Design an enzyme around this catalytic site. Structure first.
Site, PDB file in Angstrom:
ATOM      1  CG  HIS A   1     -89.199  16.344  -9.533  1.00  0.00           C
ATOM      2  ND1 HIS A   1     -87.910  16.825  -9.462  1.00  0.00           N
ATOM      3  CD2 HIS A   1     -89.667  16.337  -8.261  1.00  0.00           C
ATOM      4  CE1 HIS A   1     -87.607  17.091  -8.204  1.00  0.00           C
ATOM      5  NE2 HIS A   1     -88.656  16.804  -7.455  1.00  0.00           N
TER       6      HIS A   1
ATOM      7  CB  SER B   1     -87.122  19.421  -5.541  1.00  0.00           C
ATOM      8  OG  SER B   1     -86.571  18.194  -5.094  1.00  0.00           O
TER       9      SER B   1
ATOM     10  CG  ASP C   1     -86.378  17.429 -12.509  1.00  0.00           C
ATOM     11  OD1 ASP C   1     -87.534  17.830 -12.758  1.00  0.00           O
ATOM     12  OD2 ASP C   1     -86.017  17.057 -11.374  1.00  0.00           O
TER      13      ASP C   1
ATOM     14  N   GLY D   1     -87.906  18.829  -0.527  1.00  0.00           N
ATOM     15  CA  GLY D   1     -88.457  20.157  -0.306  1.00  0.00           C
ATOM     16  C   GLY D   1     -87.598  21.236  -0.953  1.00  0.00           C
TER      17      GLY D   1
HETATM   18  N1  LIG Z   1     -78.815  14.521  -1.470  1.00  0.00           N
HETATM   19  C1  LIG Z   1     -79.648  15.324  -2.064  1.00  0.00           C
HETATM   20  N2  LIG Z   1     -79.211  16.470  -2.534  1.00  0.00           N
HETATM   21  N3  LIG Z   1     -80.894  14.954  -2.168  1.00  0.00           N
HETATM   22  C2  LIG Z   1     -81.890  15.714  -2.789  1.00  0.00           C
HETATM   23  O1  LIG Z   1     -81.653  16.765  -3.397  1.00  0.00           O
HETATM   24  C3  LIG Z   1     -83.372  15.181  -2.672  1.00  0.00           C
HETATM   25  N4  LIG Z   1     -83.588  14.162  -1.829  1.00  0.00           N
HETATM   26  C4  LIG Z   1     -84.817  13.641  -1.658  1.00  0.00           C
HETATM   27 CL1  LIG Z   1     -84.994  12.319  -0.539  1.00  0.00          CL
HETATM   28  C5  LIG Z   1     -85.901  14.178  -2.382  1.00  0.00           C
HETATM   29  N5  LIG Z   1     -87.231  13.682  -2.256  1.00  0.00           N
HETATM   30  N6  LIG Z   1     -85.684  15.213  -3.237  1.00  0.00           N
HETATM   31  C6  LIG Z   1     -84.442  15.725  -3.395  1.00  0.00           C
HETATM   32  N7  LIG Z   1     -84.273  16.800  -4.292  1.00  0.00           N
END
Ligand SMILES: N=C(N)NC(=O)c1nc(Cl)c(N)nc1N
Length: 245
Positions: free
Chosen positions: A46, A198, A97, A196
């Site tokens: 993603h 991710s 993903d 961020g």
């Molecule tokens: N509670 C979590 N662990 N959330 C995320 O990991 C996450 N959240 C948001 Cl809002 C996002 N845009 N990417 C993510 N990877």
């Protein structure tokens, strides 16, 4: 990372910082990643699905800060960007993903191990830690939901693995989370991964060995009660990882 502590790359040597080049010279952070072998970085699809151009990416290893250089860091171009074919994204959930990034320096060489650059072990076929096991996550992601900028210094925190049954409860994520995913959170809902983070690693000490158990994939908000972070289950993708590397 909401909460947690600031750390250095020496404590997370397998962490890869992935940036995207823009027109003009402005580089921006995209996602985290993990070095699984000298020539391979594993991340999330993603992160790149909208801009599949390998030439626009820069991978940094041995880097502790977002916008400044760290002694001993190494810069790499992407030789091959392998995204998963069956990737799809629903309302919240991201499926398959997972992504592979073959790296190479200007001189055509792969990563050279050092105190700040090391690889992490992949799991064994269908062999994950038992639920309730503590694991760590790392990233340059947001510290609060209200922030629009990312922290300058790398961070890390510890979360606990949640069973699939618990994560499939109505108040959690229901049938949106599958067996190809893993849930993890702080029992007190104080610390968590955020936007961020991710593509970054979910590391668990499995049988006395640091293992890449998951990849930060998705979640509803950040550090919200009953809304755990969802991670790509690395153990279920070993055939795919091996066939492409
Ligand atoms: N509670 C979590 N662990 N959330 C995320 O990991 C996450 N959240 C948001 Cl809002 C996002 N845009 N990417 C993510 N990877």
């Amino acid at each position: 990372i909401i909460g947690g502590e600031f750390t250095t790359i020496e404590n997370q040597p397998w962490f890869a910082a992935i940036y995207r080049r823009h027109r003009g010279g402005s580089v921006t952070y995209v996602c985290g990643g993990s070095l699984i072998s000298p020539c391979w970085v594993i991340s999330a699809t993603h992160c790149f699905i909208d801009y599949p151009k390998k030439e626009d990416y820069i991978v940094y290893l041995g880097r502790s800060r977002l916008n400044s250089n760290t002694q001993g860091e190494m810069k790499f171009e992407v030789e091959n960007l392998i995204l998963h074919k069956d990737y799809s994204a629903d309302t919240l959930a991201h499926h398959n993903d997972i992504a592979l990034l073959k790296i190479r320096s200007k001189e055509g060489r792969c990563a050279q191990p050092s105190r700040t650059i090391q690889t992490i072990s992949l799991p064994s076929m269908y062999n994950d830690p038992q639920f309730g096991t503590s694991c760590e996550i790392t990233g340059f992601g947001k510290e609060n939901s209200t922030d629009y900028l990312y922290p300058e210094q790398l961070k890390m925190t510890v979360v606990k693995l949640i069973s699939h049954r618990e994560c499939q409860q109505p108040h959690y994520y229901g049938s949106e989370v599958t067996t190809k995913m893993l849930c993890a959170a702080d029992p007190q809902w104080k610390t968590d991964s955020c936007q961020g983070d991710s593509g970054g690693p979910l590391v668990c000490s499995l049988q006395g060995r640091m293992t890449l158990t998951g990849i930060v994939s998705w979640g509803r908000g950040c550090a919200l009660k009953d809304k755990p972070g969802v991670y790509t289950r690395v153990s279920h993708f070993l055939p795919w990882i091996r066939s492409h590397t």
